Amino acid sequence: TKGKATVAFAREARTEVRKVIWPTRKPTKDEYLAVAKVTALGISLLGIIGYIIHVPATYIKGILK
Amino acid sequence: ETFSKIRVKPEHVIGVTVAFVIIEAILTYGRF
Amino acid sequence: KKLIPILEKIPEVELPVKEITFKEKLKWTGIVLVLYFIMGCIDVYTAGAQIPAIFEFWQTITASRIGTLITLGIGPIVTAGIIMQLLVGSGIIQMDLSIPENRALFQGCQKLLSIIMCFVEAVLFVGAGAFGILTPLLAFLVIIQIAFGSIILIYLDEIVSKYGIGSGIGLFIAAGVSQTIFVGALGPEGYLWKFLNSLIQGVPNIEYIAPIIGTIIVFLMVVYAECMRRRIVVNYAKRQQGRRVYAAQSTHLPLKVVYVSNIPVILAAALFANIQLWGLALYRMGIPILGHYEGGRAVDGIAYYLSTPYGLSSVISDPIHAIVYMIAMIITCVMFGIFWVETTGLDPKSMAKRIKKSGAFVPGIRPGEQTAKYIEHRLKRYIPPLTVMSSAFVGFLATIANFIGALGGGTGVLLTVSIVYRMYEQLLREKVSELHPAIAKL
RNA sequence: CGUGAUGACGAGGCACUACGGUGCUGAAGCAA
RNA sequence: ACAGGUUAAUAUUCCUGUA
RNA sequence: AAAGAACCCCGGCGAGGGGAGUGAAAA
RNA sequence: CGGUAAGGUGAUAUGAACCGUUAUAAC
């Protein structure tokens, strides 16, 4: 029983911290955007590399199927 | 670590893979 | 005693204690990446050029691509890991890894099973009617190639894992999703065009651009998580003299938020992956234990209630269906998450050492930094949630990410975005370790 | 002396543990 | 303004019970 | 003119020192 | 209020953050 209570409390106590941790720039007129940048940049490379390989080979397969 | 009594150098797996490709890449396509 | 005999027969990868330059870890990774994409271009040798649509549900978490030399993809490896966490998780086979024994036991063992699940899935796939023509002869041939391709990955993972950057799996998944996006949106039968063309044709189709939006939205949402972050610390200390400066100050931060529940959720989604597969499989090959599929996927049964709704647009026409899934996923997430504890996870024990040195100590000077050295409980406490939180937090964001639905896979995009960032970090911790040949633990 | 207090504390046990130590419980608890 | 209790370090100052 | 000696070695992640470089010169 | 100006936010004092390059930078 108690176990559930503590678990429920921890979640609340955490939600409180999230309130204190923000000010800065919520988080910063450069931070957030960063993640999206690096993240998108990375996905672009992996995605782009896949496109090269991928699509050319498909053209040939169709044109010789 | 690993209890793999055998040791395999990556250069192989890579080349072994270039194998699967060539085989089926021709085993399938290039019909006839 | 253990399955050590055949276990010792299962090859491994030669790890050189030599100099593996950043440039080389990089160039290595890349070679793996391509052999992957490439294998995803090659169809499996099979006369029956006719295949029954596809399983729009397994590909994403599996990083596979049905009909190709990797039609099974990471699927096995994940399955395997799933069981282990299940056994070694529900205590069923209690193990205290600590010792290099249990550690290398849990591992080596799982690895094997991965090859077991490698073939099983193969057979199960064809047996689920993934290709249409069950020519016992031809069927056999296929299975061969199939599971053998997945094998190559298992070893390609090993390579990356000890010769390059990031992780095979992690990579692979991100590899697939990214492509699935760039191609789906811009490739041959690309959507951006189908939409663009539809505009020119004069009959603006909101259904061609839709899915593309779905993906932006998902990205922005799943990303919003990798934004927050404390800041941070800090430490202090000086009195340098060790024979060269030593001013001492104290590291900073922070780190970010999310990722932990990475491997966990990868397993939850993967569980469902082996259900829709295992149900259809044990459908057109037996009794409707799990559910009545028909039409390819499932339209009733455990299977039905446990099939992710995404693809193009969110389905409202079945509220209850939504509710269950969500809750179903949520809990499954909590599970594997807990099973990740009994095993291992973002641990304070480890952060202790390293958050108790940043500064000095030493003899020369009086640089402070008491920290620290007995004040860890402050982490395990503030910690718990961080990773999480979870089965509903991480599992929720993922699930809801699917209702919304997006290209590549709402959930897939998620993992990807994370994997990609944890992959950026990897590229930095490296760009630096390529200077001071020592601090390979700070 | 009542009450404060069918409360607390409390020898000792059932637990984890880094080995600084920490939780659950709990007898008697009066008189000359 | 007393008796318990508590901090690595405070104490008829903090917590409790009772003034 | 700080270019105030990267990096390597002994030594107690010392003291001190030996190389290596900076420098017209480290006489 | 006047001069002056591509440079500045006194020193040990670096860094950090900023202010200015044309007439409310600074002196």
Q: Is the CB of C438 under 7 A from strand F?
A: no
Going by the DSSP 8-state scheme, the letter that residue A11 receives in this structure is H
Size of interface A-C (CB pairs under 8 A): 111
The approach used to solve this structure was cryo-EM
Answer whether C191's CB lies under 8 Å from C211's CB: yes
Q: Which of C312, C72, C299 is nearest to C214 (CA)?
A: C312
Q: Where are the domains of chain C?
A: 17-164
CA distance A41 to C39: 24
Phi, psi angles (nearest 5°) of residue B11 = -50, -35
Burial of C55 (0-12, 13-18, 19+ CB in 10 A): buried
CA of C378 to C1' of E2 (A): 38
Answer whether C158's CB lies under 8 Å from C169's CB: no
Cβ partners under 8 Å of residue C134, min gap 6: C126
Is residue A4 within 8 angstroms of chain C, CB to CB? no
Domain region containing B9:
1-32
Domain region containing A34:
2-63
Domain count across chain A: 1
The alpha carbon dihedral of C60, C64, C65, C71 has a sign of negative
What is the helix (H) or strand (E) element at residue A58, kind and residue range? helix A31-63
Answer whether C40's CB lies under 8 Å from A54's CB: yes
The four Cα atoms B22, B23, B29, B31 give a dihedral, to 10 degrees, of: 130
CA distance C410 to C396: 11
Which of C7, C14, C145 is closest, CB to CB, to B3? C7
Q: HEC string of chain C?
A: CCCHHHHHHCCCECCCCCCCCHHHHHHHHHHHHHHHHHHCCCECCCCCCCCCCCCCCCHHHHCCCCCECCCCCCHHHHHHHHHHHHHCCCCCCCCCCCCHHHHHHHHHHHHHHHHHHHHHHHHHHHHCCCCCCCCHHHHHHHHHHHHHHHHHHHHHHHHHHHHCCCCHHHHHHHHHHHHHHHHHHHCCCCHHHHHHHHHHHCCCCHHHHHHHHHHHHHHHHHHHCCCCCCCCCCCCCCCCCCCCCCCCCCCCCCCCCCCCCHHHHHHHHHHHHHHHHHHHHCCCCCCCCCCCCCCCCCCCHHHHHCCCCCCCCCCCCCHHHHHHHHHHHHHHHHHHHHHHHCCCCCCHHHHCCCCCCCCCCCCCCCCCCCCCCCCCHHHHHHCCCCCCCCCCCHHHHHHHHHHHCCCCCHHHHHHHHHHHHHHHHHHHHHHHHCCCCCCCCC
CATH superfamily of C17-164: SecY subunit domain (1.10.3370.10)
Q: Which among C417, C423, C427, C428 is the top mutation candidate for probing chain A, defined by the most A β-carbons within 10 Å of its own β-carbon?
A: C417
Count, residues in chain B: 32
Cβ partners under 8 Å of residue C423, min gap 6: A42, C165, C166, C170, C171, C174
CA of C66 to C1' of F6 (A): 55
Each residue of C72-96: b (16+ CB within 10 Å) or e? bbbbbbbbbbbbbbbbbbeeeeebe
